[PDB]
């Protein structure tokens, strides 16, 4: 199970805009539909002062999982 | 506007608040609209520095939102030959905007209940639905 | 423009006005024409200082935006020779009216209403059609 | 309010508070409402700036807190013409609610018993429940 | 030109143009040319300051060019002996031209229409035909 | 509080207490309680500076807090007009009770006895129960 | 040259220029040759400034650089004694004319007709005749 | 107390030492015990800036702690209105203490004997008891 | 003492060494304990400087050590008003024996037969016991 | 000592010298005393500034050492006070004794037969015996 969750957020960066303080609240909805919006070949524009920095959300390899699985079976 | 012209004639004299407010009105006789004018433009300038976080029609109003906009409206009603004093209060008092639209501040409560003026949700996050979750009491 | 003439007699003095006013007119007598146009300049520089992240024909008209625009239409109109305060609270309103460019400061609302003026998308990006998203129930 | 105006005109000579709040009055007598307006809103301040990391309505008030909104409604009762050293203690007060409200400092306790004012758990983490830690005592 | 000397005439008091300009006149009376000369060098000065992003030949004038011509001309027209304020206004529009052709705010618009003036590509990217492209409906 | 006013009267002369404090009292007459008000919030503060890594009630008091007290009452008890080096000193035993707090002074013992006051566990950590550990004197 | 001497005695006052330039003609009388020979020296140095990126035989003159010559040419005439404002007029008319050939300001167009001064290309690169691009139809 | 009153009043001289000590008295004649209490209360200082890597109750007592300690007295015995050159030497005398305390600087001998005063091991490690080192003689 | 009085009456003119001690002893007459008390604790100060690196009874006495405590001596005995080149040198010698117990500069030797006091082990380091080491002539 | 009396009375003129001697002995009456034991510190210093890296004994004495000894022995001859000039020197020579210690620059040598003085190894590496390496000639 654990090694099934793992694979449930691997190798899929999380998506997260900073965008600056003080922007209207129209413009946080806007933002927040685009940082969604991103999917095959996604590219798009951000003023200077909004960043699109792509975390990790889960690191690691299979090998533990799979070796705890094997000498369980 | 978040405070009344009766409270501006109370932290600053009435006297003075007259002397200044008597030229700006037309005919020349004490006036009250020019003050209740400058009110409205400072509560405008805080409600700018606030809703960057806020709800901006405050359900509970900070209590010293009161001074800061007293503050302010003087300022802007010395905007002809101001006191360095007034010049100083009011650089104190964007400053103190400025942090709490940028977060290093709070801007109060209500003195009688306790209350914060609630706002938007600042960060908001969306994920795909769980699965294989601790949540998920099944299989184990 | 954003601020009418007879705000910017009420802001500041209206003898004052006059006494900027009455050289700049061809004939030497008081004229309204001249501060309508310093007002329709000052309202042209806040409109190329907001055009970068709203609709420009403003929805609704930030409450703040009629003393932005009455300070510098009197900056404008004390050209040949401003007060020290003067320069400085044009200076302060062009640094206020950068941040708002900039998205640090947000204009304010309609003080009426609690409305913000609505812009186009700052921020835009298209992708290919999704597939294989959590979105299709199919499979699974 | 933190303090009551009867420790106000204790801190600070009763003669020079009632120089300092004759004006403010309505009529032109020494009135007591104004001090305790500025002292309510000093306490405000201190509200905001406490609320940070504490319930704000306070069970157990440190005691370094009536000395605290005692100097802040001082310097905004002065807000006309201040003293240079008024100033400068309001701006060391500043800074030590500044350090209280970041973490540099406690605000203290109540000097008769020594406890420390309560606040919300300023960090706070969830995990899933917790298996194969060292305290299931079972297998092993 | 972006302004007509009507308009300089008018934000500037006519009686100080024609002091600065009788004595550049050949007969040495009060004469136009010189001050439409003057405004047809600011105006190639601007238009050089705005050829970077634009085309030249505006569509619609940005109506905060008629003042950054004024002042640039009235600059030029002061060159034997300009007032303090007039060098400082002067660096100041020659600042926001340069924050114009970096990119940093744009010119504005016309007032009565709002229209944005046209420009050429400031960023064009070729690349080959597209192949194996997700809008090509074909196998999947 | 942590020094009394027959102390605060021998460290600092009797008779400039007695003028510092005769305005301050209702009556007009030299008053003992202002004296004793003012140590108290010099302890409090003191308190709040030392309650970072002290059981704030102090088993036993370090000698040098008893100056450390007097001169902050002094401090407090001269704010309408204080001396430069008055402020100095304070200053100076404001660093003082910083470097206490932080961790780069301690406070001192009581000199009777040279005994430290005792304090809460500044670190603390806690680990499961300890196995294969070297103090298992089994298997080796 | 780019400007006449009829232009710079217009832009300049010609009893000015008659001022600095009947010292230094030979007999001691108004001569024109001294300033034809300064607008050349001027419009050398331009020359020099513009050749980076520029076939200097300019097709189309910008028409500010009849200014950014007189301004070099006054200059150049008052080498013995010049205002402060001429020699910052000249530093300015330098700095724009180092901007230009840095490429961070285009000199302008020709205003009657909007046209840009050629030149020879700055960047170019040279590879192998391609083979096996895109726009060989053949194969695929 | 490190230093007696009998050295104080032989290193600074007797009779300065009575004019500064007859007003904190209560009497107001000549007294002793002023002098014991500020000798003790920079004994007091000293021990704490001592106590960081020394055991506090002094087994010897180093030669220079009898001038470290009549300079801190000194000092606190002009907190009045001190001259310059005390307020140095006690800025002297606190850089050196904080050097001990640092471990910059030891803080001397007993002159009679040489003798360093004794104190807690600032640095102390503990290890497994040691197995297999070259000390166990068998094997080999 | 490193320094005898009969060193420093001769370094330091004796009628200023009597001017300075008279004041300092109880009867008023010139002293000479005043003087040799003086002289040791200038002893004590330089014994602390050096016992970082030398065995402090020292074996051989540098012969710039008498300068050294001379100088010491002198500004300890001038410590109510000295002049600006005491103070000057005794920064100097402050800085020398900084030098010395860090290590930039040797103290010096004895005059009478170059000897260079000697102290204890700076650096020490043990290793086990050497095994394979080249040393061992055996195998090979 | 580097540097006779006979020399430092030639270098610096014999009156000045009394000037500064004779208050400095008992008597009151020139002395030569003083002269040969300020020099002796002189020597001294550079003593401890030269056995860095010189066996300190000298074998060869460098020529300029005269000269650096008699200026160190002037300077301490005006310790009272001195003219800027003695100061700045001294100043330089100390800066040159420093390099010469560091290892900047050498003392110099002897002028009659161009020697240096010799001294203990600065740098010293000690290997296990060479094997193996090219000088044996055997193998090969």
């Known amino acids: ?73 | 506007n978040y405070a009344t012209v009766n409270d501006l004639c109370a932290r600053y004299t009435r006297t003075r608040l007259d002397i200044l407010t008597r030229p700006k009105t037309a005919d020349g006789q004490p006036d009250d609209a020019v003050a209740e004018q400058a009110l409205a433009d400072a509560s405008a300038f805080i409600d700018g520095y606030l809703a960057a976080r806020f709800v901006l029609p405050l359900t509970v109003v900070p209590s010293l939102l009161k001074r800061q906009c007293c503050v302010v409206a003087w300022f802007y009603l010395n905007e002809s030959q101001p006191t360095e004093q007034i010049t100083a209060t009011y650089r104190d008092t964007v400053r103190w905007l400025e942090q709490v639209r940028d977060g290093k501040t709070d801007p109060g409560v209500e003195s009688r209940t306790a209350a914060s003026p609630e706002g938007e949700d600042l960060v908001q996050v969306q994920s795909d639905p769980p699965v294989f979750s601790r949540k998920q009491k099944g299989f184990i």
Do not use: C, H
């Open chain 1, 1 to 73: 199970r654990d090694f099934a969750e793992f694979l449930e957020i691997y190798g899929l960066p999380m998506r997260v805009g900073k965008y600056p303080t003080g922007s209207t609240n129209r413009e946080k909805a806007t933002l927040m539909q685009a940082v969604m919006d991103i999917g095959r070949r996604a590219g798009g524009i951000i003023p200077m002062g909004m960043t699109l920095d792509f975390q990790s959300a889960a690191d690691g390899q299979s090998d533990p999982f799979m070796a705890m699985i094997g000498w369980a079976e």
